[PDB]
Design a protein around this nucleic acid. Structure first.
Ligand SMILES: [Mg+2]
Lengths: 1280, 73, 550, 32, 101
RNA sequence: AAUAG
């Protein structure tokens, strides 16, 4: 046990040993970006691949070319924290070495006249952080992986649902990574048609003719030949034995049945058959037959032989005739009938027809047609069947060559045609479109490489255009390359792509789940409305690869998936999952990662299979799965086993205790809502857990993990200094490690990110130990919510539907109080009238509102502010304003007139009260820094001095020097002092950060981990809540009616186990309080940890006295227990745990009504549930408006709480009002509340006068409609 | 001979072009109405909702009736 | 260029701007879902409107809704200004604005006086029928959440798991009177689609009324003679008799006949304590037989329907409020709770599973002998497992529905079970036979994504827990259900819009058109039984030809 | 008028009521 | 706007030229209060102030055409205007108009 | 796009 785990050991109720630990959860991001940016000597991945794909750039004439040498990434201007503060992208400069080689015209082509080698700046590449995130414009973002259709060839059918009859129509689609699409389809007349890029169909034979295939060659490729001879004045079939098995058969020695088995007579073996001429009459010729004497073609290819034709060849002396084999079951004339409907007879005609279908309305020339056909599929510039696409193509058509080819050829097209014809005949099957072997994962590295190659092509066009000019004596490579297109491409992808998403940052689990998210949408994917049922379904290949539970509930159902716990992407982008080998009947601890294609062959047992001490299966027939179908299989036929019991579910589903007792519809909700939990003031571990909490806490990156072991030299709320062990020093190293903690930093969802130390000075630490706990972490365990005392009973209708009744104590102990940090900005710009000024001289505002402001007009740090309070004072110059005559008279009476400037200041939003915790001032380079900005600059300089001095002192104390530290401090000073690159016209920016403490209140959303969500209805007094015989009231009362119809029984089991765990914790607390002997404490702890037949062997004898005391202290608030998914605690274990803690075995206590003192007539299930506070707070959702801003064109109220907008009275509301008959209410809604400009002012004045009458007019939207219809040249008018 | 139309076709073939345009196929409805020179009397609910007037149902019904008297006189 | 200005994309390639997207023309201005007709003319954004999360107010009356104070202050601001100016507290409108912004106590008193009798309109999206908008009298509450009466939730399809409602303030006198007369919740208690009551109690209410009206053998206070409902309540409050004690109570019952005759009879009836205590709130004019039984959802529906049909609207509203109060109170007092021991798994389940498995092995052996084909094997295995599931469900229901008790004579008697899950399902509060099957019996045969049935069923319930394969098979159907719901929502919305368009012009314009034509109505027969009676078809229709006696 | 219990009044928009009544339940929708 | 695709920038643009209904009500109140205050003055002074400030009139007037009323006297009109302003500045008849500052 | 109903 590690020290952090030794501090609080969680009891494990699992029974199956784990042979494979859960791998790093953020590998799918880090590995992809490493592939992108790392240098590849083989040049197959990333920037090197893109550069070698575009370069060398060759001029059209041949004068010169630009060649690629190498690339490197420079040093970032700012770090991640500095980029987030300033609002800039964290990135590295791309520097590429290129040589412009200029050839000699007089010399033969290829003579190196000159070379010019130089480094070129080719843009700025955004960098991935240590946790798999990007910082774009100061915002943390995650690029989501895509599940797309693999490149290659796919054979499909319409399933007999297009034509009037069944007639199942078959098609084959070739889809590349880049380039046009190729389609081969059957019509209901059994003819083969070709489509290029989804346009008008053409007969398939055309594509063969453009490839130089004669009609006879086509027939030879697509048909077998039955031959005929004239032997001794008799007709001659060449017999193929397999075909025969309506006429009299030859071979008089072995006569077969005549006009009425085959194998017995074929056993002897003859090569001679005699047949009627009528057998020839129906056949179709296979060759073109010419006569030298006549000079004409007696019979053409693909022509039906006739009697006169037979006579003509008889006179011509030809004795052998071959025709095509054609049947109705195994062989078909489809290619012959296609040739019949084909009007093309030569390569040029086919090229011309392809040009007409490509580019209609253009005069076809031979050269243009040839160039078009070459560019469509056989040009590497415009076609790319990628390596994955090539491998899938070759596997489909059974080709074992051209592994590195990226373009189609004759063999590929002909093999696709043959396979489609074969599928029509009956040999072969169509492809499963939703099979995970046909769907590929495309991650950040691939998409970045694609966009970077796009930028490279953009600049390559201009480079070729310039090199074609010729005047290159004074041209250097950096004068040829414009990096702005490449930068535009990369910023487009990283900031405006659909898959570049604003990071989910409510809790660590939200971040981990977001980084492990796979979308079917995005560029090159599906669309929400156009996606069908089949793609949204759970395929049998999702086992161990995609979680069947975690998926968004809504229009996105089935299109967004979560990676499973052990899922991985192979080198080709296909998901694979680990399995344990079964060798010689024993289950080996060797692991093989199998993909969907490889999985189908084998018989794979489940992790629940019983095992013997020798490693083999106990039962003779085991439950396994093969080809996606489950069943019972012999023990000797099992080839693989599942590595873990949580292999099929994702991390969020793996965090749900007793998941096997929950219906999947509710497990979906539980997994989704675990990601919306808001961290609280005090993180509390779950009493009932699954064991994956530590993994999420460590792999999220929110915690501070010891890079090296040692002894904690110094601990503080903001800094941890570790004295490293003597065995783990880099020779000549200071010997200390410094961990600076994040303290009250805003997250993407305006929550609080705070790191709290969990170590003491002098405490030994090993590698991987948790030194500080991030948000929603407790001693290295994920702590999303709080443990609540729960009673399942109705309480006077306050838990009606899904309502939740909460005790006042829960509010008093601040158990669900949350900190929300909000950022506000005041931007002083430059206007035509003048420059906006930030100052405390605010007109028409007294000294009451200026108390919290300083001389510079900015609020003090630590100022408690309420709604409407001024944070930053700002005055905007205003123009001359016309005064009404009454205002002129009022000014004449009282002469005051001070209206030079207008108060446009930053104020706290209404219903927001908090504390100012940070103020930042950004000033444009060349604008005077006010007193406050100078104060912040001095404070930052002093803090940098102090931090550098302390760090230097500790590192020199560990070691036991001026130029290097002076350089570091000079760099820090330059970063602090310099001006800020702000948006044009912006003179100054002041950002104020407000910390708001939000307490639980009616309207807040609370949930468990089983889909049991609800809204708080009442905050009950403690004396009114149900209580037990010992006087302890419950904390939350939940409705028992929500359990049976929703089939989430894991919540009841969790309640029972939580009651047991809290009882055992109370027993431990009692033993500590009475100061019993440590031997008794050890005996009790060992009894607790030995309960059940579990896989955990915790020996308290190996723990020191201080360790036992620490463990007992950490078990005071309840014993944490682990119940893994599908390997959980049985009911017998729960009852034994209840009996140990001296609690009823049924989990039901006798409760009394606090209002009356009377016992409830039945026992009530009382226990402890882990409850969460979701980020759906009534503070952010309560809106109201009477009158406000209006739209510019429609003159209707704006929309949104941010704009103080109004609710939309849609069509269905109008229908409801019409059904009621409320004509006057409807007219109010249409006219005087939305867009009757005169009517709404009159209505406001009437209400102020207390008259309550309206004078409706014409809505402005109708006037707009009239104007647009008139603008369409249509006279629309109103008649009286 | 009476004809049975679907709800979509019946909706598109109403007398008023305001309602038909507001339903769907705005270009076809407006083109046909413009070439024909149609006149909309605003007899249904949708037209009066669009022009901001009282709907000829319920509390507004009587109101519209009164107007139909005044046009009669 | 002119074609692009008028209708972009009709002639050919649509002209695109610097954003690489087609330019929006005048035809796009006027047409489509996002066009002027539908976005701005058939629906609009409105003033004097708000929105908030909805909680439950179990103390409210059917015409009341709990409205937050700050939300009301913002919504009713001009009214507050008017009353401040009228009563002299504010000299001008700017002074009134300052007072409202400073939130003085007199402003709160003015707000109370403003909202005293001003109805407010509550809306929940999607508004599938006119009961999605109803008018309530607002009661100012401290908080930020709207309090909604439970009995209206079914009309709104509203549950308290995060639902949000919009609120609108009718301004003019006509709109206020329309809210009070037409849209008020007390006026809309019948379903316009069928005429059935829409405010029928559900869940806890029903459960409470179910628990109070059940009957127990040899309860405390059995055989006692009671003077009336008041003494039954007194006996209950003094712990003399239980709610489920079989007693004899003197009941005074008034019956209002069809002609209006009011007949009062006093007599001694065999009943329970709870039934008389519930009779205490029943309005006069109804028989005691409506209460002298165990009251599920259907029985309470019948009570409300008879109250409406024989007494009117005011009595029905008061009766509904009292029913909901009593149901909540006695559901709280019952202590009904769900526990792991409430899921009683029958001992016959394992024997039935073993028998089914053995006979499946026999059928597989017959398949290996060529006696039956593969399709026959599949079909008979499926029938075997379906019969096993039915038998296990029957055994589980039989075990869960009954118990044995000792009566006064000392003998053993059969009593209907007080199991919490059984009570929840039987009362109609929540749960059905199939869901209890899944909790305590077998999950049964499941379907593949295409629709085919998997031969081996899930032979485990949610109490025992499924293994990995069983859970995967379950997910196969769960995903299909969710996707089907998501897509059918859009399909139904489009259908409803088309229907509303085609029928929007139909208004009752006359009283009698003077036509002799009509339709012929007969009971619906689709076999050997009536699908629906002639009474249900004819209730509410005007006779066209005289109904001569046969 | 089913929602009111008496004969329908003049001016009642019965077409909208009919359309809403039909459309609302659309979500619930799938010889001896 | 943002990551949406059914949103548009033009849907979030205000009409800054509109007048708040509070301001319109305040203007009407100021008109009424000014009329009431003028009603408590001599008709000659009320008319002179009305012409000199444009109240209930299309145009404002200078001292010359105000003198053109009865006696063309700039120094006299100026004196009577000063007297009217002095009487209107008295706290007895200015508390109503003070609230509009 | 994501999220809630
Ligand atoms: Mg809901």
């Amino acid at each position: 046990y590690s020290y952090t785990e030794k501090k609080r050991i969680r009891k494990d109720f699992g029974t199956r040993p784990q042979v494979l630990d859960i791998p790093y959860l953020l590998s799918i991001q880090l590995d992809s970006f490493e592939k992108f940016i790392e240098q590849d000597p083989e040049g197959q991945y990333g920037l090197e691949a893109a550069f070698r794909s575009v370069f060398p750039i060759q001029s059209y004439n041949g004068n010169s070319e630009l060649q690629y040498v190498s690339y490197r990434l420079g040093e970032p201007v700012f770090d991640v924290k500095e980029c987030q503060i300033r609002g800039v992208t964290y990135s590295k400069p791309l520097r590429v070495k290129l040589r412009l080689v200029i050839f000699d015209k007089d010399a033969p082509a290829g003579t190196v006249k000159d070379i010019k080698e130089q480094e070129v700046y080719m843009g700025e590449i955004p960098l991935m952080t240590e946790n798999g995130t990007f910082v774009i414009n100061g915002t943390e973002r995650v690029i989501v992986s895509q599940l797309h259709r693999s490149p290659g060839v796919f054979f499909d059918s319409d399933k007999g649902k297009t034509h009037s009859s069944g007639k199942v129509l078959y098609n084959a689609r070739i889809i590349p990574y880049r380039g046009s699409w190729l389609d081969f389809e059957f019509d209901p007349k059994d003819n083969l048609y070709v489509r290029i890029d989804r346009r008008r169909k053409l007969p398939a034979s055309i594509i063969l003719r453009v490839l130089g295939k004669t009609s006879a060659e086509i027939l030879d490729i697509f048909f077998e030949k039955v031959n005929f001879e004239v032997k001794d004045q008799t007709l001659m079939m060449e017999l193929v034995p397999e075909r025969l098995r309506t006429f009299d058969i030859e071979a008089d020695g072995k006569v077969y049945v005549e006009k009425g088995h085959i194998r017995q007579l074929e056993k002897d073996g003859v090569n001679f058959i005699e047949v009627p001429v009528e057998y020839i009459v129906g056949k179709v010729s296979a060759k073109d037959y010419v006569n030298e004497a006549t000079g004409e073609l007696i019979i053409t290819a693909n022509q039906e032989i006739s009697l006169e034709a037979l006579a003509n060849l008889s006179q011509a002396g030809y004795k052998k005739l071959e025709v095509l084999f054609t049947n109705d079951l195994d062989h078909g004339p489809f290619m012959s009938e296609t040739l019949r409907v084909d009007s093309t007879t030569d390569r040029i005609s086919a090229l011309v027809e392809i040009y007409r279908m490509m580019r209609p309305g253009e005069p076809p020339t031979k050269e243009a047609a040839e160039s078009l056909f070459e560019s469509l599929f056989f040009s590497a510039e415009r076609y790319d069947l990628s390596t994955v696409g090539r491998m899938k193509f070759n596997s489909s058509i059974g080709r074992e060559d051209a592994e590195e080819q990226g373009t189609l050829d004759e063999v590929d097209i002909i093999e696709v045609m043959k396979k489609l014809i074969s599928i029509r005949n009956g040999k072969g099957e169509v492809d499963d479109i939703d099979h995970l072997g046909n769907r590929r994962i495309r991650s950040v590295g691939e998409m970045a490489e694609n966009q970077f190659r796009v930028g490279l092509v953009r600049v390559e066009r201009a480079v070729k255009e310039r090199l074609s000019l010729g005047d290159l004596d004074n041209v250097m490579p950096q004068d040829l390359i414009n990096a702005k297109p490449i930068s535009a491409a990369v910023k487009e992808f990283f900031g405006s792509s659909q898959l570049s998403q604003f990071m989910d940052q409510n809790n660590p689990l939200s971040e981990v789940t977001h980084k492990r998210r796979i979308s079917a949408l995005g560029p090159g994917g599906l669309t929400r409305e156009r996606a069908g049922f089949e793609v949204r379904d759970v395929h049998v290949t999702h086992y161990g690869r995609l979680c069947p539970i975690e998926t968004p509930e809504g229009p996105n159902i089935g299109l967004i998936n979560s990676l499973s716990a052990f899922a991985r992407c192979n080198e080709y982008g296909f998901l694979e999952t680990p399995y344990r080998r079964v060798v010689n009947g024993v289950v080996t601890d060797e692991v093989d990662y199998l993909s969907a294609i490889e999985e189908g062959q084998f018989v794979i047992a489940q992790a629940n299979a019983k095992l013997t001490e020798e490693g083999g299966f106990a039962d003779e027939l085991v439950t396994a799965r093969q080809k996606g179908e489950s069943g019972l299989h012999p023990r000797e036929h099992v080839d693989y086993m599942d590595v873990a019991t949580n292999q099929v579910v994702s991390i969020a589903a793996s965090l749900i205790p007793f998941l096997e007792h929950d219906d999947a519809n509710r497990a979906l909700m539980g997994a989704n809502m675990q990601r919306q939990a808001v961290p609280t003031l005090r993180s509390e571990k779950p009493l009932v857990g699954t064991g994956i909490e530590r993994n999420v806490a460590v792999d999220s990156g929110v915690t501070a993990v010891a890079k090296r072991g040692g002894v904690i030299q110094s601990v503080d709320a903001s800094r941890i200094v570790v004295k490293v062990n003597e065995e783990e020093l880099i020779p000549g190293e200071a010997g200390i490690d410094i961990y600076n903690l994040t303290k009250y930093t805003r997250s993407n969802q305006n929550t609080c990110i705070n790191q709290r130390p969990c170590v003491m000075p002098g405490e030994p630490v090993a590698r991987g130990d948790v030194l500080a706990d991030g948000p929603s972490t407790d001693l290295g365990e994920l702590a999303l919510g709080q443990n609540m005392r729960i009673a399942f009973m109705p309480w006077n209708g306050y838990n009606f539907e899904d309502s939740i009744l909460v005790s006042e104590r829960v509010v008093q102990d601040d158990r669900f109080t949350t900190i929300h940090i909000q950022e506000l900005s005041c931007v002083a710009r430059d206007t035509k009238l003048g420059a906006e000024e930030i100052t405390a001289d605010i007109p028409n505002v007294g000294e009451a509102a200026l108390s919290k402001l300083d001389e510079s007009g900015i609020v003090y740090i630590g100022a408690e502010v309420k709604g409407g309070d001024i944070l930053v004072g700002k005055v905007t110059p205003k123009g001359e304003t016309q005064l009404t005559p009454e205002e002129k008279l009022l000014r004449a009476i009282f002469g005051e007139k001070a209206s030079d400037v207008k108060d446009t200041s930053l104020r706290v939003p209404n219903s927001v009260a908090g504390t100012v915790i940070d103020v930042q001032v950004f000033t444009r380079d060349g604008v005077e820094k006010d007193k406050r900005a100078l104060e912040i600059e001095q404070m930052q300089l002093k803090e940098a001095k102090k931090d550098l001095t302390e760090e230097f002192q500790i590192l020199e104390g560990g070691l036991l020097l001026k130029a290097d530290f002076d350089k570091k401090f000079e760099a820090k000073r330059r970063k602090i002092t310099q001006g800020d690159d702000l948006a044009p016209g912006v003179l100054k920016i002041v950002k104020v950060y407000l910390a708001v403490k939000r307490r639980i209140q009616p309207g807040d959303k609370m949930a468990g981990r089983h889909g049991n969500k609800g809204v708080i209805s009442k905050i009950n007094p403690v004396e009114d809540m149900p209580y037990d015989e010992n006087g302890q009231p419950v904390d939350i009362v939940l409705n028992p009616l929500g359990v049976p119809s929703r089939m989430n029984i894991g919540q009841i089991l969790e309640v029972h186990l939580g009651l047991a765990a809290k009882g055992i914790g109370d027993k431990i607390n009692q033993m500590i309080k009475e100061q019993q002997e440590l031997a008794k404490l050890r005996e009790f702890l060992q009894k607790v940890y030995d309960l059940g037949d579990t896989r955990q062997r915790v020996d308290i004898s190996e723990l020191s006295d201080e360790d036992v005391r620490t463990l007992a202290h950490n078990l005071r608030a309840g014993l944490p227990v682990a119940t893994p998914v599908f390997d959980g605690a049985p009911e017998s274990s729960i009852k034994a745990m209840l009996e140990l803690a001296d609690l009823p075995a049924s989990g039901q206590l006798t409760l009394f009504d606090g209002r009356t003192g009377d016992a409830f007539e039945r026992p009530v299930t009382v226990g402890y549930m882990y409850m969460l506070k979701l980020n759906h707070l009534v503070d952010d959702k309560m809106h109201a408006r009477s009158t406000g801003s209006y739209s510019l064109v429609t003159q209707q109220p704006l929309g949104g709480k941010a704009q103080f907008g109004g609710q939309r009275f849609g069509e269905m509301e109008v229908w409801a009002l019409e059904a009621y008959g409320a004509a006057y209410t409807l007219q109010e809604m249409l006219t005087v509340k939305s867009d009757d400009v005169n009517g709404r002012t009159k209505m406001y004045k009437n209400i102020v006068d207390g008259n309550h009458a309206m004078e409706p007019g014409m809505p402005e939207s109708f006037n707009v409609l009239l104007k647009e219809i008139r603008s369409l040249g249509i006279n629309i008018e109103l008649e009286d | 001979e009476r004809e049975l139309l679907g709800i979509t076709k019946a909706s598109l073939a109403t007398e008023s072009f305001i309602s038909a345009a507001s339903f769907q196929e705005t270009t076809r409805v407006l083109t046909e109405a413009a070439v024909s020179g149609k006149r909309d009397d605003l007899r249904g609910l949708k037209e009066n909702v669009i022009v901001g007037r009282l709907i000829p149902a319920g509390t507004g019904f009587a109101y519209h009736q009164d107007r139909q008297a005044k046009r009669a006189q | 260029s002119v074609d692009a200005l008028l209708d972009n994309g009709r002639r050919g390639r649509a002209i695109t701007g610097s954003n690489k997207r087609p330019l929006k023309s005048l035809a796009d201005m006027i047409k489509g879902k996002q066009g002027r007709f539908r976005q701005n003319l058939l629906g609009k954004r409105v003033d004097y409107s708000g929105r908030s999360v909805i909680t439950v107010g179990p103390y409210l009356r059917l015409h009341q809704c709990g409205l937050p104070k700050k939300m009301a202050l913002e919504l009713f601001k001009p009214f507050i200004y008017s009353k401040l100016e009228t009563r002299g507290l504010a000299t001008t409108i700017k002074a009134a604005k300052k007072m409202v912004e400073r939130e003085e106590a007199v402003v709160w008193d003015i707000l109370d006086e403003v909202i005293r009798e001003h109805p407010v309109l509550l809306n929940r999206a999607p508004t599938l029928h006119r009961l999605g908008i109803q008018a309530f009298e607002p009661v100012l509450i401290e908080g930020k959440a709207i309090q909604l009466h439970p009995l209206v939730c079914a009309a709104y399809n509203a549950d308290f798991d995060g639902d949000q409602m919009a609120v609108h303030v009718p301004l003019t006198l006509e709109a206020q009177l329309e809210a009070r007369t037409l849209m008020m919740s007390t006026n809309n208690i019948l379903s316009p689609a069928s005429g059935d009551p829409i405010i029928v109690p559900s869940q806890d209410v029903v459960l409470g009324l179910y628990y109070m009206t059940r009957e127990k053998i040899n309860a405390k206070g059995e055989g006692m003679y009671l003077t009336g409902p008041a003494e039954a309540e007194k006996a209950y409050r003094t712990k003399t008799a239980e709610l489920h004690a079989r007693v004899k109570v003197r009941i005074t019952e008034t019956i209002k006949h069809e002609n209006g005759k009011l007949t009062t009879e006093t007599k001694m009836i065999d009943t329970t304590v709870g039934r008389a205590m519930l009779w205490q709130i029943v309005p006069k004019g109804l028989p005691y037989s409506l209460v002298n039984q165990k009251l599920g959802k259907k029985q309470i529906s019948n009570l409300l329907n008879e109250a409406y049909r024989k007494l009117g609207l005011k009595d029905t509203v008061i009766f509904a409020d009292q029913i909901m109060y009593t149901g909540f109170a006695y559901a709280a007092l019952s202590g009904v709770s769900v526990g792991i021991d409430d899921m009683v798994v029958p001992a016959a389940k394992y024997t039935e599973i073993a028998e089914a498995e053995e006979e499946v092995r026999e059928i597989q052996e017959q398949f290996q002998s060529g006696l039956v084909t593969a399709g026959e094997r599949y079909n008979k295995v499926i029938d075997i497992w379906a019969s096993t599931n039915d038998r296990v469900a029957k055994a589980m229901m039989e075990n869960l529905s009954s118990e044995q008790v000792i009566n006064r004579q000392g003998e053993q008697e059969k009593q209907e079970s007080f199991n919490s899950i059984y009570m929840m399902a039987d009362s109609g509060a929540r749960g059905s036979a199939a869901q209890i099957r899944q909790l305590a019996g077998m999950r049964g045969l499941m379907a593949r994504p295409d629709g085919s049935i998997i031969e081996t069923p899930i032979t485990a319930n949610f109490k025992e827990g499924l293994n990995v394969l069983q859970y995967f098979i379950s997910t196969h159907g769960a995903r299909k259900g969710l996707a089907d719901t998501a897509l059918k929502t859009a399909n139904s919305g489009y259908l409803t819009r088309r229907l509303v368009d085609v029928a929007q012009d139909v208004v009752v314009t006359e009283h009698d058109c003077g036509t002799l034509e009509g339709v012929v109505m007969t009971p619906h027969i689709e076999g050997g039984d009536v699908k629906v009676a002639l009474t249900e078809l004819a209730l509410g229709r005007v006779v066209s030809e005289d109904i001569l006696k046969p | 008028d089913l929602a009111r219990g008496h004969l329908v009044n003049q001016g009642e928009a019965v077409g909208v009521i009919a359309a809403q009544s039909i459309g609302e339940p659309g979500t619930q929708l799938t010889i001896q | 706007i943002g990551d949406d695709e059914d949103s548009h920038l033009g849907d979030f643009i205000e009409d800054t030229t509109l007048e708040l209904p509070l301001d319109s009500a305040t203007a009407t109140s100021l008109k009424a209060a000014t009329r009431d205050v003028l009603a408590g003055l001599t008709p000659r002074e009320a008319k002179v102030l009305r012409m000199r400030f444009g109240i209930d009139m299309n145009t404002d007037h200078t001292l010359e055409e105000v003198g053109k009323q009865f006696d063309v006297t700039r120094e006299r009109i100026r004196q009577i205007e000063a007297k009217a302003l002095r009487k209107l500045r008295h706290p007895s008849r200015s508390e109503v108009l003070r609230s509009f500052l």
